[PDB]
Design a protein around this ligand. Sequence first.
Ligand SMILES: *[C@@H]1O[C@H](CO)[C@@H](O[C@@H]2O[C@H](CO)[C@@H](O[C@@H]3O[C@H](CO[C@H]4O[C@H](CO)[C@@H](O)[C@H](O)[C@@H]4O)[C@@H](O)[C@H](O[C@H]4O[C@H](CO)[C@@H](O)[C@H](O)[C@@H]4O)[C@@H]3O)[C@H](O)[C@H]2NC(C)=O)[C@H](O)[C@H]1NC(C)=O
Ligand SMILES: CC(=O)N[C@H]1[C@H]([C@H](O)[C@H](O)COC(C)=O)O[C@@](O[C@H](CO)[C@@H](O)[C@@H]2O[C@@](O)(C(=O)O)C[C@H](O)[C@H]2NC(C)=O)(C(=O)O)C[C@@H]1O
Ligand SMILES: *[C@@H]1O[C@H](CO)[C@@H](O[C@@H]2O[C@H](CO)[C@@H](O[C@@H]3O[C@H](CO)[C@@H](O)[C@H](O)[C@@H]3O)[C@H](O)[C@H]2NC(C)=O)[C@H](O)[C@H]1NC(C)=O
Ligand SMILES: *[C@@H]1O[C@H](CO)[C@@H](O[C@@H]2O[C@H](CO)[C@@H](O)[C@H](O)[C@H]2NC(C)=O)[C@H](O)[C@H]1NC(C)=O
Ligand SMILES: *[C@@H]1O[C@H](CO)[C@@H](O[C@@H]2O[C@H](CO)[C@@H](O)[C@H](O)[C@H]2NC(C)=O)[C@H](O)[C@H]1NC(C)=O
Ligand SMILES: *[C@@H]1O[C@H](CO)[C@@H](O[C@@H]2O[C@H](CO)[C@@H](O)[C@H](O)[C@H]2NC(C)=O)[C@H](O)[C@H]1NC(C)=O
Ligand SMILES: *[C@@H]1O[C@H](CO)[C@@H](O)[C@H](O)[C@H]1NC(C)=O
Ligand SMILES: *[C@@H]1O[C@H](CO)[C@@H](O)[C@H](O)[C@H]1NC(C)=O
Ligand SMILES: *[C@@H]1O[C@H](CO)[C@@H](O)[C@H](O)[C@H]1NC(C)=O
Length: 268
Amino acid sequence: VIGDFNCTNFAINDLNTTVPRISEYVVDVSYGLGTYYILDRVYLNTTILFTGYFPKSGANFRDLSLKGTTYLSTLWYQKPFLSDFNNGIFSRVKNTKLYVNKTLYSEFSTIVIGSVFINNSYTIVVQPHNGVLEITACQYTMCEYPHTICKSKGSSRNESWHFDKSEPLCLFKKNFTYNVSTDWLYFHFYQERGTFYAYYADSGMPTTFLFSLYLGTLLSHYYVLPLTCNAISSNTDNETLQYWVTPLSKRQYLLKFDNRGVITNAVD
Ligand SMILES: *[C@@H]1O[C@H](CO)[C@@H](O[C@@H]2O[C@H](CO)[C@@H](O[C@@H]3O[C@H](CO[C@H]4O[C@H](CO)[C@@H](O)[C@H](O)[C@@H]4O)[C@@H](O)[C@H](O[C@H]4O[C@H](CO)[C@@H](O)[C@H](O)[C@@H]4O)[C@@H]3O)[C@H](O)[C@H]2NC(C)=O)[C@H](O)[C@H]1NC(C)=O
Ligand SMILES: CC(=O)N[C@H]1[C@H]([C@H](O)[C@H](O)COC(C)=O)O[C@@](O[C@H](CO)[C@@H](O)[C@@H]2O[C@@](O)(C(=O)O)C[C@H](O)[C@H]2NC(C)=O)(C(=O)O)C[C@@H]1O
Ligand SMILES: *[C@@H]1O[C@H](CO)[C@@H](O[C@@H]2O[C@H](CO)[C@@H](O[C@@H]3O[C@H](CO)[C@@H](O)[C@H](O)[C@@H]3O)[C@H](O)[C@H]2NC(C)=O)[C@H](O)[C@H]1NC(C)=O
Ligand SMILES: *[C@@H]1O[C@H](CO)[C@@H](O[C@@H]2O[C@H](CO)[C@@H](O)[C@H](O)[C@H]2NC(C)=O)[C@H](O)[C@H]1NC(C)=O
Ligand SMILES: *[C@@H]1O[C@H](CO)[C@@H](O[C@@H]2O[C@H](CO)[C@@H](O)[C@H](O)[C@H]2NC(C)=O)[C@H](O)[C@H]1NC(C)=O
Ligand SMILES: *[C@@H]1O[C@H](CO)[C@@H](O[C@@H]2O[C@H](CO)[C@@H](O)[C@H](O)[C@H]2NC(C)=O)[C@H](O)[C@H]1NC(C)=O
Ligand SMILES: *[C@@H]1O[C@H](CO)[C@@H](O)[C@H](O)[C@H]1NC(C)=O
Ligand SMILES: *[C@@H]1O[C@H](CO)[C@@H](O)[C@H](O)[C@H]1NC(C)=O
Ligand SMILES: *[C@@H]1O[C@H](CO)[C@@H](O)[C@H](O)[C@H]1NC(C)=O
């Protein structure tokens, strides 16, 4: 389970759907994937050695996205999907572009980052709403079996990842826009000295700082929420979710900046 609040028992089973395991892909930073822009500094036409929170090059990404239709598996809410956060994670996220009457809609998996996921602790939640990235850090009463829905194509079940009938205490609540037309989003989520840090990019690969948040406590787990949809499958549209994650660690990188200050290349 993620939280311990019984939000529902509608269409839950124990099936091991990942007979083909958690999908894998290899980290390659040679074109600036896994890197970020440094503070308020601009470097031009140069190579820098910098120590930052970065992927290990040649490590695996795990695809933790979980598309459902009606049923949820209890095994989706356990290890290996419920994951240790440690120093942080780098995410490579597919923007699943769906269409209704030729209007484009953007979907991708929510990530929750926390410790015990109980309403006596703060859970950071990062959720897309078709070009708005809603980010909150609140004392959420997380469900046992949290998930999101396609609001675009609909779903055979209602959205429930928390059950707070009155608004919970929040340390953070902001909306960041993102370009609904891009194929990929990139995120760094990391912690240092009881402060959480987020970086993202919706365009290019090197991420830029979104926000930081003092928590005063260690984050220990993260979980990519299942998304339930009547679309996003081979029998209906051949679309897919992908939410690739890999661990961060404190690493020295070479970073190369072009004559317009973009990180074009890196070495671990
Ligand atoms: C912070 O988060 C915690 C969870 O970590 C929340 O605590 C839980 O809150 C719920 C709701 O109050 C507790 O609900 C339990 O419901 C059982 C019956 O459920 C069915 O029936 C009701 C209608 O009667 C429906 O609403 C419901 O949907 C179900 O269909 C009761 O049997 C439970 O009773 C407990 O206490 C009695 C003694 O008083 C014992 O006899 C029982 O055996 C049982 O132990 C209870 O009412 C749930 O138990 C809570 N869990 C914990 C760990 O406390 C907090 O509500 C939340 N706080 C805030 C501010 O959001
Ligand atoms: C994490 C994972 O494994 N994700 C896959 C999912 C699950 O394995 C399955 O949900 C688990 O189920 C449990 C826990 O019991 O299966 C999907 O594929 C299905 C066939 O496997 C799909 O074709 C569905 O087939 C139906 O027969 C049915 O109900 O499953 C009719 C339904 O209308 C149709 N869905 C549509 C139209 O999207 C899906 O989507 O659900 C593709 C997802 O990538
Ligand atoms: C950040 O972005 C999210 C997503 O767009 C915003 O949440 C949405 O805010 C609107 C306006 O408050 C909500 O609509 C209202 O909902 C109530 C309850 O159903 C209804 O009575 C009102 O008439 C109105 O429809 C909407 O429900 C809410 N959630 C979603 C998923 O859309 C949020 O307000 C933005 N701002 C901040 C500071 O977070
Ligand atoms: C979780 O909550 C659900 C309700 O959302 C509980 O399901 C009900 O259980 C009682 C047991 O007497 C039945 O009479 C009802 O028919 C059930 N369904 C509904 C819709 O109320 C469920 O028991 C709870 N606990 C667990 C472990 O799932
Ligand atoms: C970016 O920096 C490089 C390295 O200093 C510059 O490349 C040199 O350019 C001169 C002509 O201006 C050539 O004679 C050298 O042979 C080049 N060296 C290399 C290693 O290519 C480059 O001009 C700079 N560009 C900008 C726009 O600043
Ligand atoms: C939103 O994202 C799309 C897709 O990456 C951007 O479209 C590209 O725009 C450049 C010019 O800026 C063109 O050279 C490319 O050919 C476009 N690609 C496609 C697939 O159309 C778009 O510019 C972005 N818009 C904003 C405001 O960020
Ligand atoms: C699910 O099935 C695969 C293939 O047999 C296996 O490797 C994996 O350990 C199973 N997972 C669980 C939770 O049993
Ligand atoms: C979804 O919510 C509506 C409104 O409360 C309800 O009528 C419907 O039965 C719910 N369906 C499920 C599967 O929870
Ligand atoms: C999905 O792709 C496969 C392979 O190209 C094809 O056989 C199938 O008809 C496609 N289905 C849909 C709904 O596009």
